[PDB]
Amino acid sequence: ITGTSTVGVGRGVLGDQKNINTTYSTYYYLQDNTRGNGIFTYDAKYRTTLPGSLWADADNQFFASYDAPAVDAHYYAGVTYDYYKNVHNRLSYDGNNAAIRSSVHYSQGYNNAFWNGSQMVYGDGDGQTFIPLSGGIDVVAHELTHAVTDYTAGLIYQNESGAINEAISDIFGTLVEFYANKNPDWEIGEDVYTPGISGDSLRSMSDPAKYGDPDHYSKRYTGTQDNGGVHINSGIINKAAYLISQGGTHYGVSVVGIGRDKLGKIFYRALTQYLTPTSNFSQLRAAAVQSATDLYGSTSQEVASVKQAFDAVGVK
Numbered sequence: 001i002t003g004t005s006t007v008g009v010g011r012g013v014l015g016d017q018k019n020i021n022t023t024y025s026t027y028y029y030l031q032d033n034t035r036g037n038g039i040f041t042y043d044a045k046y047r048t049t050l051p052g053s054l055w056a057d058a059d060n061q062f063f064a065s066y067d068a069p070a071v072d073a074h075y076y077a078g079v080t081y082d083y084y085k086n087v088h089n090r091l092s093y094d095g096n097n098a099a100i101r102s103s104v105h106y107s108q109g110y111n112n113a114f115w116n117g118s119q120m121v122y123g124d125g126d127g128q129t130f131i132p133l134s135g136g137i138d139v140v141a142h143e144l145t146h147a148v149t150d151y152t153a154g155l156i157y158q159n160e161s162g163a164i165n166e167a168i169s170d171i172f173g174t175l176v177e178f179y180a181n182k183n184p185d186w187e188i189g190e191d192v193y194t195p196g197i198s199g200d201s202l203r204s205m206s207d208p209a210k211y212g213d214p215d216h217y218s219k220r221y222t223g224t225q226d227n228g229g230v231h232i233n234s235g236i237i238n239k240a241a242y243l244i245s246q247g248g249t250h251y252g253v254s255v256v257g258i259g260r261d262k263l264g265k266i267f268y269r270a271l272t273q274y275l276t277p278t279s280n281f282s283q284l285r286a287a288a289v290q291s292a293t294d295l296y297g298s299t300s301q302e303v304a305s306v307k308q309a310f311d312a313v314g315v316k
Protein backbone atom coordinates (compact mmCIF):
# COMPACT_ATOMS: atom_id res chain seq x y z
CA ILE A 1 0.00 0.00 0.00
CA THR A 2 0.98 3.65 -0.27
CA GLY A 3 1.99 5.16 3.04
CA THR A 4 4.89 6.32 5.18
CA SER A 5 7.61 4.05 6.50
CA THR A 6 7.52 3.44 10.25
CA VAL A 7 9.12 1.19 12.85
CA GLY A 8 6.99 -1.02 15.06
CA VAL A 9 7.94 -3.28 17.93
CA GLY A 10 6.74 -6.75 18.77
CA ARG A 11 7.55 -10.19 20.11
CA GLY A 12 8.24 -13.28 18.04
CA VAL A 13 7.28 -16.91 18.52
CA LEU A 14 10.06 -17.55 21.07
CA GLY A 15 9.13 -14.43 23.12
CA ASP A 16 11.99 -12.22 21.94
CA GLN A 17 11.37 -8.52 21.34
CA LYS A 18 12.41 -7.05 18.00
CA ASN A 19 11.79 -3.96 15.90
CA ILE A 20 10.02 -4.40 12.57
CA ASN A 21 9.71 -2.12 9.55
CA THR A 22 6.07 -1.17 8.96
CA THR A 23 4.02 1.22 6.79
CA TYR A 24 1.40 3.63 8.14
CA SER A 25 -1.78 4.49 6.26
CA THR A 26 -4.72 4.60 8.74
CA TYR A 27 -3.47 1.23 10.05
CA TYR A 28 0.14 0.07 10.54
CA TYR A 29 0.92 -2.64 7.99
CA LEU A 30 3.60 -5.33 7.94
CA GLN A 31 5.17 -3.73 4.88
CA ASP A 32 8.94 -3.07 5.02
CA ASN A 33 9.87 -0.46 2.40
CA THR A 34 13.58 -0.44 3.33
CA ARG A 35 14.42 -3.67 1.46
CA GLY A 36 14.10 -3.84 -2.30
CA ASN A 37 10.57 -3.48 -3.57
CA GLY A 38 9.26 -4.40 -0.17
CA ILE A 39 8.67 -7.22 2.29
CA PHE A 40 4.96 -7.86 2.85
CA THR A 41 3.42 -10.14 5.47
CA TYR A 42 -0.18 -11.38 5.34
CA ASP A 43 -2.75 -13.06 7.64
CA ALA A 44 -4.19 -16.28 6.16
CA LYS A 45 -6.60 -16.42 9.13
CA TYR A 46 -6.45 -20.23 9.51
CA ARG A 47 -7.59 -20.73 5.87
CA THR A 48 -5.75 -21.96 2.78
CA THR A 49 -6.83 -19.07 0.49
CA LEU A 50 -3.61 -17.16 -0.33
CA PRO A 51 -2.27 -14.67 0.40
CA GLY A 52 -4.96 -13.51 2.77
CA SER A 53 -4.99 -9.92 3.95
CA LEU A 54 -1.97 -7.66 4.33
CA TRP A 55 -1.29 -7.61 8.06
CA ALA A 56 -2.85 -4.49 9.62
CA ASP A 57 -2.46 -3.35 13.24
CA ALA A 58 -4.03 -0.37 14.99
CA ASP A 59 -1.08 0.78 17.12
CA ASN A 60 2.23 -0.51 15.63
CA GLN A 61 2.78 -2.78 18.66
CA PHE A 62 2.81 -6.51 17.94
CA PHE A 63 2.84 -8.26 21.32
CA ALA A 64 -0.29 -10.43 21.04
CA SER A 65 0.15 -14.20 20.81
CA TYR A 66 -1.60 -14.09 17.42
CA ASP A 67 0.95 -11.53 16.22
CA ALA A 68 4.05 -13.60 16.98
CA PRO A 69 4.23 -15.70 13.78
CA ALA A 70 3.78 -12.58 11.66
CA VAL A 71 6.52 -10.69 13.52
CA ASP A 72 9.01 -13.49 12.87
CA ALA A 73 8.00 -14.18 9.25
CA HIS A 74 8.44 -10.46 8.54
CA TYR A 75 11.65 -9.96 10.50
CA TYR A 76 13.40 -13.13 9.31
CA ALA A 77 12.53 -12.40 5.68
CA GLY A 78 14.43 -9.16 6.26
CA VAL A 79 17.41 -10.95 7.76
CA THR A 80 17.46 -13.34 4.82
CA TYR A 81 17.29 -10.43 2.36
CA ASP A 82 20.18 -8.77 4.20
CA TYR A 83 22.27 -11.96 4.07
CA TYR A 84 21.91 -12.37 0.31
CA LYS A 85 22.49 -8.66 -0.39
CA ASN A 86 25.40 -8.06 1.97
CA VAL A 87 27.17 -11.41 1.53
CA HIS A 88 26.44 -12.32 -2.10
CA ASN A 89 25.39 -8.98 -3.66
CA ARG A 90 22.06 -10.56 -4.59
CA LEU A 91 18.98 -8.30 -4.48
CA SER A 92 16.07 -10.47 -3.32
CA TYR A 93 15.35 -13.90 -4.71
CA ASP A 94 15.24 -12.90 -8.39
CA GLY A 95 18.29 -10.61 -8.17
CA ASN A 96 16.07 -7.64 -9.14
CA ASN A 97 14.57 -6.81 -5.72
CA ALA A 98 11.32 -8.73 -6.15
CA ALA A 99 8.86 -8.13 -3.35
CA ILE A 100 8.97 -10.85 -0.69
CA ARG A 101 5.48 -11.92 0.39
CA SER A 102 4.68 -14.21 3.32
CA SER A 103 1.43 -15.54 4.78
CA VAL A 104 1.11 -16.82 8.35
CA HIS A 105 -1.64 -18.71 10.21
CA TYR A 106 -2.05 -20.96 7.16
CA SER A 107 -4.76 -23.59 7.79
CA GLN A 108 -5.27 -25.30 11.18
CA GLY A 109 -2.60 -27.28 13.00
CA TYR A 110 -0.45 -27.26 9.86
CA ASN A 111 2.97 -28.80 10.52
CA ASN A 112 4.81 -27.27 7.56
CA ALA A 113 6.02 -24.15 5.77
CA PHE A 114 6.69 -23.70 2.08
CA TRP A 115 7.47 -21.48 -0.86
CA ASN A 116 4.54 -21.94 -3.26
CA GLY A 117 6.27 -20.55 -6.37
CA SER A 118 5.25 -16.95 -5.57
CA GLN A 119 5.33 -16.49 -1.78
CA MET A 120 6.11 -17.96 1.63
CA VAL A 121 3.44 -19.86 3.56
CA TYR A 122 3.74 -20.78 7.27
CA GLY A 123 1.60 -23.12 9.32
CA ASP A 124 1.18 -22.64 13.06
CA GLY A 125 1.95 -26.29 13.84
CA ASP A 126 -0.24 -28.47 16.05
CA GLY A 127 1.59 -27.38 19.21
CA GLN A 128 3.18 -30.82 19.65
CA THR A 129 5.15 -31.53 16.47
CA PHE A 130 5.72 -27.83 15.73
CA ILE A 131 5.04 -24.37 17.09
CA PRO A 132 4.54 -21.67 14.42
CA LEU A 133 7.23 -22.41 11.88
CA SER A 134 8.29 -18.83 11.13
CA GLY A 135 9.89 -18.91 14.59
CA GLY A 136 12.83 -20.72 12.98
CA ILE A 137 15.23 -18.46 11.09
CA ASP A 138 16.66 -21.52 9.33
CA VAL A 139 13.11 -22.51 8.24
CA VAL A 140 12.46 -19.04 6.79
CA ALA A 141 15.81 -18.90 5.00
CA HIS A 142 15.52 -22.53 3.84
CA GLU A 143 12.27 -21.90 2.02
CA LEU A 144 13.28 -18.47 0.66
CA THR A 145 16.38 -20.17 -0.69
CA HIS A 146 14.08 -22.42 -2.76
CA ALA A 147 12.99 -19.19 -4.49
CA VAL A 148 16.63 -18.30 -5.15
CA THR A 149 17.23 -21.77 -6.59
CA ASP A 150 14.11 -21.57 -8.76
CA TYR A 151 15.39 -18.32 -10.33
CA THR A 152 18.94 -19.63 -10.83
CA ALA A 153 19.86 -23.31 -11.20
CA GLY A 154 16.23 -24.40 -11.41
CA LEU A 155 16.94 -27.84 -9.94
CA ILE A 156 13.93 -30.11 -10.47
CA TYR A 157 12.33 -31.29 -7.23
CA GLN A 158 12.92 -35.01 -7.59
CA ASN A 159 15.68 -37.60 -7.21
CA GLU A 160 19.28 -36.32 -7.05
CA SER A 161 18.51 -32.86 -8.46
CA GLY A 162 15.83 -32.45 -5.81
CA ALA A 163 18.13 -33.64 -3.02
CA ILE A 164 20.65 -31.01 -4.18
CA ASN A 165 17.82 -28.44 -4.17
CA GLU A 166 17.00 -29.40 -0.57
CA ALA A 167 20.64 -29.37 0.53
CA ILE A 168 21.14 -25.88 -0.97
CA SER A 169 18.19 -24.68 1.13
CA ASP A 170 19.65 -26.32 4.27
CA ILE A 171 23.11 -24.87 3.58
CA PHE A 172 21.92 -21.29 3.16
CA GLY A 173 19.27 -21.61 5.85
CA THR A 174 22.10 -22.55 8.22
CA LEU A 175 24.40 -19.80 6.93
CA VAL A 176 21.65 -17.22 7.51
CA GLU A 177 21.22 -18.62 11.02
CA PHE A 178 24.96 -18.11 11.60
CA TYR A 179 24.74 -14.62 10.04
CA ALA A 180 22.07 -13.63 12.57
CA ASN A 181 24.25 -15.25 15.25
CA LYS A 182 21.48 -16.34 17.66
CA ASN A 183 22.12 -19.90 18.86
CA PRO A 184 23.57 -21.01 15.51
CA ASP A 185 24.03 -24.68 14.70
CA TRP A 186 24.13 -27.18 11.82
CA GLU A 187 20.67 -28.62 12.56
CA ILE A 188 17.41 -27.71 10.84
CA GLY A 189 14.25 -26.51 12.59
CA GLU A 190 15.35 -26.96 16.22
CA ASP A 191 13.75 -23.68 17.30
CA VAL A 192 10.21 -24.71 16.30
CA TYR A 193 10.27 -28.54 16.39
CA THR A 194 8.78 -30.52 19.30
CA PRO A 195 8.43 -27.99 22.13
CA GLY A 196 8.22 -30.92 24.52
CA ILE A 197 11.59 -32.44 23.54
CA SER A 198 14.89 -30.61 24.01
CA GLY A 199 17.87 -31.07 21.72
CA ASP A 200 16.22 -32.51 18.60
CA SER A 201 15.46 -31.14 15.12
CA LEU A 202 14.19 -32.29 11.71
CA ARG A 203 17.64 -32.94 10.21
CA SER A 204 21.33 -32.65 11.05
CA MET A 205 23.93 -31.50 8.54
CA SER A 206 26.91 -32.49 10.70
CA ASP A 207 25.54 -35.99 11.42
CA PRO A 208 22.58 -36.71 9.11
CA ALA A 209 22.40 -40.24 10.50
CA LYS A 210 21.42 -38.75 13.90
CA TYR A 211 17.91 -38.66 12.39
CA GLY A 212 18.30 -41.60 10.02
CA ASP A 213 19.35 -39.75 6.89
CA PRO A 214 22.25 -41.06 4.78
CA ASP A 215 25.75 -39.65 5.13
CA HIS A 216 27.32 -41.60 2.24
CA TYR A 217 26.24 -42.17 -1.36
CA SER A 218 26.24 -45.94 -0.80
CA LYS A 219 23.44 -45.45 1.74
CA ARG A 220 21.22 -43.36 -0.52
CA TYR A 221 17.49 -43.97 -0.67
CA THR A 222 16.50 -45.33 -4.06
CA GLY A 223 12.69 -45.58 -3.75
CA THR A 224 9.92 -43.17 -4.67
CA GLN A 225 8.80 -41.75 -1.31
CA ASP A 226 9.49 -38.04 -0.76
CA ASN A 227 9.88 -37.35 -4.51
CA GLY A 228 12.70 -39.88 -4.62
CA GLY A 229 14.14 -38.99 -1.22
CA VAL A 230 14.78 -35.27 -1.65
CA HIS A 231 14.75 -34.65 2.16
CA ILE A 232 16.58 -37.92 2.81
CA ASN A 233 19.41 -37.96 0.29
CA SER A 234 20.01 -34.30 1.01
CA GLY A 235 21.98 -35.64 3.99
CA ILE A 236 24.76 -36.77 1.66
CA ILE A 237 25.28 -33.24 0.30
CA ASN A 238 24.65 -31.58 3.66
CA LYS A 239 27.40 -33.72 5.14
CA ALA A 240 29.81 -32.78 2.36
CA ALA A 241 29.02 -29.10 2.94
CA TYR A 242 29.52 -29.47 6.69
CA LEU A 243 32.90 -31.12 6.06
CA ILE A 244 33.98 -28.42 3.62
CA SER A 245 33.25 -25.75 6.24
CA GLN A 246 34.24 -27.42 9.51
CA GLY A 247 36.46 -30.35 8.48
CA GLY A 248 36.57 -33.85 9.87
CA THR A 249 37.38 -37.45 9.09
CA HIS A 250 34.39 -39.36 7.74
CA TYR A 251 34.49 -43.02 6.68
CA GLY A 252 38.26 -42.69 6.94
CA VAL A 253 38.58 -39.70 4.59
CA SER A 254 40.04 -36.56 6.16
CA VAL A 255 38.82 -33.08 5.18
CA VAL A 256 40.49 -29.80 6.18
CA GLY A 257 37.80 -27.22 6.84
CA ILE A 258 37.87 -23.83 5.15
CA GLY A 259 35.10 -22.10 7.10
CA ARG A 260 31.49 -21.07 6.59
CA ASP A 261 32.16 -17.94 4.53
CA LYS A 262 34.11 -19.83 1.86
CA LEU A 263 31.54 -22.63 1.89
CA GLY A 264 28.93 -19.97 1.18
CA LYS A 265 30.90 -18.38 -1.65
CA ILE A 266 31.63 -21.75 -3.28
CA PHE A 267 28.07 -23.02 -3.16
CA TYR A 268 26.53 -19.67 -4.12
CA ARG A 269 28.77 -19.61 -7.21
CA ALA A 270 27.94 -23.26 -8.02
CA LEU A 271 24.21 -22.54 -7.69
CA THR A 272 24.21 -19.43 -9.84
CA GLN A 273 26.83 -20.27 -12.47
CA TYR A 274 27.13 -24.03 -12.96
CA LEU A 275 24.16 -26.07 -11.76
CA THR A 276 21.29 -26.90 -14.13
CA PRO A 277 17.75 -28.21 -13.65
CA THR A 278 18.83 -31.85 -13.97
CA SER A 279 22.22 -31.75 -12.22
CA ASN A 280 23.06 -34.92 -10.31
CA PHE A 281 25.42 -35.36 -7.35
CA SER A 282 28.47 -36.01 -9.54
CA GLN A 283 27.69 -32.84 -11.49
CA LEU A 284 27.34 -30.94 -8.22
CA ARG A 285 30.85 -32.06 -7.24
CA ALA A 286 32.14 -30.78 -10.57
CA ALA A 287 30.30 -27.48 -10.13
CA ALA A 288 31.71 -27.01 -6.63
CA VAL A 289 35.24 -27.90 -7.76
CA GLN A 290 34.99 -25.40 -10.63
CA SER A 291 33.52 -22.71 -8.36
CA ALA A 292 36.30 -23.10 -5.79
CA THR A 293 38.82 -22.98 -8.64
CA ASP A 294 37.39 -19.71 -9.99
CA LEU A 295 37.54 -18.14 -6.54
CA TYR A 296 40.74 -19.52 -5.00
CA GLY A 297 42.80 -21.19 -7.73
CA SER A 298 43.35 -24.72 -9.02
CA THR A 299 45.99 -25.54 -6.39
CA SER A 300 44.25 -23.97 -3.42
CA GLN A 301 43.40 -25.73 -0.18
CA GLU A 302 39.81 -24.78 -0.91
CA VAL A 303 39.69 -26.91 -4.07
CA ALA A 304 41.45 -29.81 -2.34
CA SER A 305 38.96 -29.72 0.53
CA VAL A 306 35.97 -29.73 -1.82
CA LYS A 307 37.36 -32.90 -3.42
CA GLN A 308 38.06 -34.56 -0.07
CA ALA A 309 34.57 -33.78 1.21
CA PHE A 310 32.83 -35.32 -1.78
CA ASP A 311 35.26 -38.25 -1.54
CA ALA A 312 34.24 -38.71 2.11
CA VAL A 313 30.56 -39.05 1.18
CA GLY A 314 31.24 -41.30 -1.81
CA VAL A 315 30.40 -38.83 -4.60
CA LYS A 316 32.79 -38.93 -7.54
Ligand SMILES: O=C(NO)[C@]12CC[C@H](CC1)C2
Nearest residue numbers: 112113114139142189231
Ligand atom coordinates in the same frame (compact mmCIF):
# COMPACT_ATOMS: atom_id res chain seq x y z
O1 LIG B 1 12.33 -29.54 4.40
C1 LIG B 1 11.60 -28.56 4.36
N1 LIG B 1 11.17 -28.00 3.22
O2 LIG B 1 11.48 -28.59 2.00
C2 LIG B 1 11.14 -27.85 5.61
C3 LIG B 1 10.36 -26.57 5.31
C4 LIG B 1 9.60 -26.30 6.61
C5 LIG B 1 10.06 -27.41 7.55
C6 LIG B 1 11.53 -27.01 7.80
C7 LIG B 1 12.28 -27.44 6.53
C8 LIG B 1 10.20 -28.59 6.58
Ligand SMILES: [Ca+2]
Nearest residue numbers: 057059061062
Ligand atom coordinates in the same frame (compact mmCIF):
# COMPACT_ATOMS: atom_id res chain seq x y z
CA1 LIG C 1 -1.16 -3.94 18.08
Ligand SMILES: [Ca+2]
Nearest residue numbers: 182183184185
Ligand atom coordinates in the same frame (compact mmCIF):
# COMPACT_ATOMS: atom_id res chain seq x y z
CA1 LIG D 1 19.85 -22.69 16.27
Ligand SMILES: [Ca+2]
Nearest residue numbers: 138187188189
Ligand atom coordinates in the same frame (compact mmCIF):
# COMPACT_ATOMS: atom_id res chain seq x y z
CA1 LIG E 1 19.40 -24.51 12.92
Ligand SMILES: [Ca+2]
Nearest residue numbers: 193194195197
Ligand atom coordinates in the same frame (compact mmCIF):
# COMPACT_ATOMS: atom_id res chain seq x y z
CA1 LIG F 1 12.27 -29.96 20.23
Ligand SMILES: [Zn+2]
Nearest residue numbers: 142146166169
Ligand atom coordinates in the same frame (compact mmCIF):
# COMPACT_ATOMS: atom_id res chain seq x y z
ZN1 LIG G 1 12.99 -27.55 1.23
